[PDB]
Every structure is written in C-alpha cells, then in structure tokens.
Amino acid sequence: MKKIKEAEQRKLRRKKRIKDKIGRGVASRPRITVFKSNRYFYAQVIDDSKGHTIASISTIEKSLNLGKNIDDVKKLGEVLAKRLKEKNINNLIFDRNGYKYHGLIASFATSLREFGINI
Amino acid sequence: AVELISLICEETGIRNYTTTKNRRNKQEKLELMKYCPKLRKHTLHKEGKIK
Amino acid sequence: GQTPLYRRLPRKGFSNSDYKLEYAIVNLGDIDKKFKDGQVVNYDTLLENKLIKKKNKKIKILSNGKLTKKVSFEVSKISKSAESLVIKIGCTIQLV
Amino acid sequence: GSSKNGRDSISKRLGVKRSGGQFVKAGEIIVRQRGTKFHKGKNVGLGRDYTIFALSSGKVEFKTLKGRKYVSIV
Amino acid sequence: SLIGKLNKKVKVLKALGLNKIGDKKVHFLNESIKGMLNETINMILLSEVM
RNA sequence: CGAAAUGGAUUUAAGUUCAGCCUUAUUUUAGUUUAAUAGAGGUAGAGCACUAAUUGAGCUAGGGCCUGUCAAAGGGUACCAAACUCAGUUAAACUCCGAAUGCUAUUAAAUGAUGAAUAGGAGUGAGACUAUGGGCGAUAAGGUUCAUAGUCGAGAGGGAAAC
RNA sequence: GGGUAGUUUGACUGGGGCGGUCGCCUCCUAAAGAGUAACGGAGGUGCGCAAAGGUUACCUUAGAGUGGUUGGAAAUCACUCUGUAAGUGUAAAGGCAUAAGGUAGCUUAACUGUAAGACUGACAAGUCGAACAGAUACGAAAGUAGGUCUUAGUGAUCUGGCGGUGGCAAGUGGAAGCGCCGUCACUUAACGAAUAAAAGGUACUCCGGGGAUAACAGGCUUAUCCUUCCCAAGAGUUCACAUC
RNA sequence: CCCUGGUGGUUAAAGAAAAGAGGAAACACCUGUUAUCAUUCCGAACACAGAAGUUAAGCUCUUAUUCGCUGAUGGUACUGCGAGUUCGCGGGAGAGUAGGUUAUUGCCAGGG
C-alpha cells in the first residue's frame, strides 16, 4: 500500500527533476526517453514543440526478436541509430527518465554513440 | 581569528589572488588550483603573506 | 559641506608636459587642395602656403581626404595608412 | 525614559517592473523580489537573487497553475 | 466652474473641451464621451442636436 | 509666461548644494483624460485553514483531594485541566479567501503647444488650513508628523452678521 | 613647563540641558504599483564557513495514535493517520517537494579578459544580466559552476608600505623617484568621514538676531482639579432614596 | 478505430479512503544474487539475471459524495462619485445556502 505508493512517488519526483534539468526537445535536437519494464525495454524520440514521437523502438518488436540483456539492447540501439539516420536526426538529449545511468542504459547510450548520434 | 592570505602562482611566484582564511582552525598550508593569467592556464597556488 | 565631487573621485597621473613632442598635423586632403605636382612638401613650403605656422617644425602627415598628385615629401613623421596611399599614388617620402 | 527603538531600513523598491502584456526586449528586468513569489516560465530566467528577466524580445504574460504564478515571454 | 473641483475632474473637463462657464461644445456620443460625461455629470448641461 | 515651502546629502537644522518645480531660445512630437481589452495586490471588508488571544456545553488525559488508601496493584471525581467535538467571538506586525479605486500596457476617439531633449538664467529647500485615510496624544487641543485633492500662500468679487 | 600664547570641545531634541540616538538589515505603521514621517511599535548585526562552496547521484521530516530492556510525557526502532506545521550556519520576512532539506563520491568556477540590454537612483554609488574568448571542475552527455536560498557582516579621497610589469628618466647613459596592474594599513561607530594631532566655566559677561525657542500673562484643550447628575447594592431596629 | 503501456498539452481535488468487476495482450506483483552497481547496516529501494504463478496489491472501470475541493442567483459588508444625505448613480464581495465535482485531450508502439 503506502510503501508501493511512496516508491512511485519517488520515481515521479526524480523524473520531474530530470526533465527540467535537461530541458525540452526541439525538432533539431529532440529528446530520447526510455522505459524499463519487468519484461521489455522502450525508447521514444519526442519533439515537444509538437508533442510528437518522431521515432521509437522496443524489444516487443517481433522482427528484432532481441532479449532483455546488454547484448540485446546494444543491437537495439544499433537499429535505432539506423532508423534515425534515414530521418536525418543526429543530435539528441538523453532523458534517463527516472532511472540511473548504469548497466542497460549505459550500453544503450554508448551503442547510439558509436554510430554517429550526438547525445 | 581570520586573516587575509594571498594565493601565489607556483611557477611564476606572482601573487595572483587574495582571499580570507581562518587561522587557529587548520594552521595548514592551503593549496588551490587557480587559473594563472600570466600563463593562460590553471595551476597550483599556495598560501602566503600579504605584508 | 558634503564632500565635493572633485574630492570623492581619485586622481589618474601626471600630465607629461615638459616632455611632449608637440607638432603640427597636415592632412592629405589639405595637400591635394593646396599643392601641385613636383614640388617638395616640407617645412618651408607648408609655412609659406599657410598650412602651418613657423612656431612648430616637426610636422606629421595624416590621411584625411584624398590626394591625387605626385609630390615629394620631407617630413618628420607619417602614418602608415597615409604613406601607403602616397606610395600607391606614386610620391616619395624622406623622413627628417 | 526614552524610546527603546526606532530603526528602519531603506525601502528596496521591489515589485513588478513590466506589466503583463507589455513589450520587452532581451535582458529586461520584469520582477524584483526576495524568493520566487513568481516562478519562471518559457523564455525567462532567474538571477541569483530571484530577479525575473527576459531572455528574448516579446510580450510579458502571467499564468497561474495550482495557485502559483508563472512569468513568460510570448 | 472649475475652481476648487478635483484635479481628475478638471482634467476630464479640459479633455471634453470646456474651459469656462458658458462653454458650448458638440460631441458625438460613443463609449468614450459617455464615460467622460458620466464622470462630470454634475457640472454639465446636455441638450440634444436634432 | 509663471513657482517652491518636496526629496537626497551636509560640524546640516535660520545656511548652502543637486534633483524636482519656473522662464527664454532652438530642435523634436505625443503629455493627460477616458472606453474596450489584457496584467500584478493583500488594503478595507471578511474569515479561523496557519501563527496567537478567547466564551458556554459535550468529552477526556494528567495532577491534587477524598474513599477498603503504609510509598504496592485499586475507586468516587464537587475540582486544577492538555487534547478532541458542537456553537459563538479578537488580531497593524494571523490570512484558507478578497474587492471598489489606484497603478501599468495596447487600440480607437476626444482635447491643441499641456510632452521630451539641448543651451542660457534664477528663485525655492520654515508652510498653513479644509474635505478623507493615518500614527502619536487622552478615538483632547487652531497640537505634532505622513498620504490624496482643493484653497490661501501668490486671488480681486458675492455669500457664511464681522471673520 | 596653564608661567604664557593661539584654538577645540557636534547635531537631532515637541525650549534648552540631562538622558538617549547616529551605519546597515527584517516586519508593521504604509491607506492592495513604487515611494511615504516620528524621540512610532518589535528584532538582529560590524560574522561564520576550505565546507556550511561548486558539480553529479541518491533520499525526506515535525506532530498525534499504537507496540517495545533501561526508556518515564519525552532518547532509539516499527506501523497507522497527518502532508511541510519539520528543517534551511547566523535576525526576521519573502521563498524552498523538482526541495534551496538530508547523505555520499569527485572537485576548487571562492576563475581571467569581457559584455548586449536594465532596475534602483540629485550626484557619487549599488544590483541583475543572456551571450563571447581562454583555462578548467563535475557529469556519459546535454548542461551547471564568475562563492554561501535570497535580503545586513561594512568605510570615500589623500598619504604610506609590499609584489609584479618596465611607461616616465630635466645634456646623454644609469639610478632615485613616479605612473600602470595586484594589494595592505582608519570604532574616520558623529559610520557621504571639516585637522595627522583637542576638555570645562562665565550669576562679571559682551555682540549680532529670533516669539522660528523657555520662564510671568493672552488664546486652545480639559488629562488633572472642582462643582453636579444618572443606577441603588446597603447602612439607617424593620424602612434603596430622612440622611449617607 | 478501441484496450493497455509510454510520452505532451489543456490546471477546476485531474485529491485520498471504503466496496465491486478483470489481468488475452500490456503492465505490475512475484524468482535468484553469481556477473557490473548500490546501501552511513539491509537484493527493501536500486542493480543484474528470468517468466513458475497471481488480481491479493499497484493500475483500469463501476459506486453512495461518506471526507475534501469547487461553487450559484440574491442580500449584506465595503468602495468610486455626486448642489438628492443614512440619500442619488456606478462597481461589488467574503461567508452561508440551492448545488456540482473521482477530468479532458494531441500522437508513438503491441492487437484486436
């Protein structure tokens, strides 16, 4: 009850502070946010001048058939990079979205980095 | 119990900075990485007298 | 009784008089308007043509206005812009 | 038995300097205050002493959200 | 008269164009003139220009 | 054509200086009053959610008294009473709320040298009273000291018996 | 060394003197922009901090109720309700859940040359400031950092001292000295500071003026004083009003 | 299009508590600490490795408005102005009351 509620509340507070520390995204340099469920891994690129998701990816996508490991998110970030290049976006701001930059997120971000995306 | 000290660039000896420091609290020899405008480069500055 | 402004404000330094090198300014536009080709713009001619007064004898040449006439110069100082323009027009410069 | 007190500081001239709807150019001071009586919205910045200033030319506007006032340049 | 009246009301009357007693001015009633007349109703006499 | 008796500073308080106010000349052209629309208050008022004051009931710790009480574990509560409930009140330095005016911006009318800048030249820097909002005093004083407006000051005439 | 000479010994002040006060900050007075007096009503202050700074990351009290060796109303711990009343070096106010609160790691931006555009303002001053260059600190990066959550912790000019730079160098060349940059020494607290250096009396007094300022009176007010009146609990054997 | 998850805008409680409904997908709880990480101790949170199980909880929907929040129309307080004076004109609360309120919406992904 209260313990789960306060865990949620802490996550929201962290999320909000992160958001206004990094600022909003613009069509030139939009914002990349992630979400880490118990099963999957989601990423979205958002332009807040419109509230529009320019691109997105997740491990649910059957064709990718990745898992939920460091290796899998490495490959997933590769796929995201190749999907964004054809829409000619190279600057992104990395909203860690209430998580700690470590492990899976670290591998995801570095994989976007080795392939010419400015985060 | 607070004295006005001067931070001196190590490699030139210029008294680049002046600051305040409390004696009788540390009586150490405060060192600070400060930017030495003669060299256009940061470096080490040590505590020293004023007069 | 308020401390006056010239006593609130501080001072700035000496005046360096008694050691100034003071001397007359003559401009290229003036030379163009007053002279012609071939003569020596110098102390004597500027004095008689009333571009300076014979109190000062260390003329400097500055570059206001434009000069078109080939002339010879015997002066004491010259600005870089003015001597560039004058060499370009094709005159000659001796520093005295 | 004289007065024990009688002591006052200099008035600091706080308050809103440009009214909502006025046209300002970059760098204008909008509010002088102690503390975020008014918070910062789009296109404004907060000084080290909570002054509100305009990052770009525009028209001042005040909004209210959950009872807090926000200043913006639109 | 304008003597002794409030400063604001003297300014309103001079904005209507009346400086003395016996001053005659024709005006077209819109919201502005209506507001000025309401401010200074006690010092004016309104007749209508057929 | 037309003041000031205000502000700032001062071995200043009967002085003097700067600003403001005034005038001459030139240049410049948008004061001010509304209406519409768009802004920020905590004043009046109101109120008890917050900080405090405080009334009658309900309820109840705790403390004291009494009662089969050794200073152990018990009970009666005429009381001293935290907290709590209902009802009703006080606050310039309390405000969960909040005007009317005033202030500020834009536009359209309306009013015609009222604005601003530069240059030249002063004077003033002792105010008083009335209609309001105040503080101090004794919700006393033609009292003292602030804010708005008017008058006298610098304004003749008519009226309030003279004033 | 007052034998003798030249001078100083403040102002505000509901007369003056005595007393008290003089810079700055917070709130009210202050009449809902700002500003706005008083010898109006309340406080703090002439610092502290090498972290109590900067950056990144991670977290939330106080109180009420309940259960626990000391441990009781209250120390520490668990949970429910409450949701900032807790806490922010230091006074108070305005603010602070994204916490500006708390903890931990790294670190010195507690930088240099600067600055578009402003607020406040008689002036002198004071404050905010995007952004640019160099050098960094932190973070993966975006970004932040030009001290302290903000608002008091302060002092002009002149003179003198120290360090750096090498402009000035009285015939020339050195040097002295000075300028420039960095910077120290004033309870100058009467704090926009008249001197580097300062106490009293004058009823023996004098001069220039003021009802702008006291004492005797005029005038205003009535605190105070005095003279009444309204209510009648009682006393008066009983009977509020014979009387008090 | 809809359910779910994630992400914006529109700020009126878009609030908590109690009761009922589900869980395909999705989400969450849940498994182990052994790999990098975190704790002023503690896989609680976080970190990493996975899918045995569930609606119990979180979440979604439906509920009496039980608590809160919001709020009429009038009237009053107060206020601008006035040769009408306890009035004439203009503006108009707070509180209380009749009520109302457990949002709405832009676009990304999975499939009904």
Side-chain angles (χ1 to χ4, degrees), chain B residues 24-37:
Chain B
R24 313 294 305 118
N25 205 354
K26 284 191 156 56
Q27 55 280 358
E28 300 161 59
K29 287 308 151 292
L30 181 64
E31 282 88 359
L32 283 182
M33 191 56 41
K34 296 282 262 179
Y35 169 89
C36 198

Side-chain angles (χ1 to χ4, degrees), chain B residues 4-17:
Chain B
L4 274 58
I5 64 165
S6 166
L7 299 188
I8 312 163
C9 200
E10 276 282 34
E11 315 171 3
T12 313
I14 299 177
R15 287 152 33 165
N16 263 326
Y17 292 108

Side-chain angles (χ1 to χ4, degrees), chain A residues 24-115:
Chain A
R24 294 171 182 90
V26 181
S28 296
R29 182 179 83 268
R31 165 186 48 169
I32 175 68
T33 69
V34 311
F35 170 72
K36 184 167 57 163
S37 160
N38 296 93
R39 302 286 168 140
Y40 296 116
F41 186 103
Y42 305 75
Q44 299 202 29
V45 179
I46 300 97
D47 174 60
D48 300 12
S49 60
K50 317 297 189 66
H52 285 347
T53 302
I54 305 298
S56 65
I57 195 177
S58 199
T59 54
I60 296 182
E61 299 184 40
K62 285 75 84 172
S63 57
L64 291 163
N65 65 44
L66 278 299
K68 194 181 169 284
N69 288 317
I70 296 99
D71 296 329
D72 312 314
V73 298
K74 282 165 150 69
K75 310 309 293 315
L76 185 142
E78 180 60 25
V79 178
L80 183 63
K82 83 115 174 179
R83 199 173 315 165
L84 184 62
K85 285 179 296 265
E86 53 89 7
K87 291 170 172 181
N88 66 11
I89 312 296
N90 292 4
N91 294 327
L92 288 184
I93 51 174
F94 192 88
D95 183 359
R96 62 213 186 89
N97 181 43
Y99 302 123
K100 194 178 80 63
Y101 187 109
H102 176 47
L104 272 292
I105 295 192
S107 309
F108 192 30
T110 189
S111 295
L112 285 74
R113 274 194 190 109
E114 288 109 17
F115 300 81

Side-chain angles (χ1 to χ4, degrees), chain D residues 11-24:
Chain D
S11 304
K12 287 306 177 315
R13 275 97 173 150
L14 313 173
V16 175
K17 295 302 157 183
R18 251 55 165 172
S19 62
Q22 197 174 3
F23 166 82
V24 304

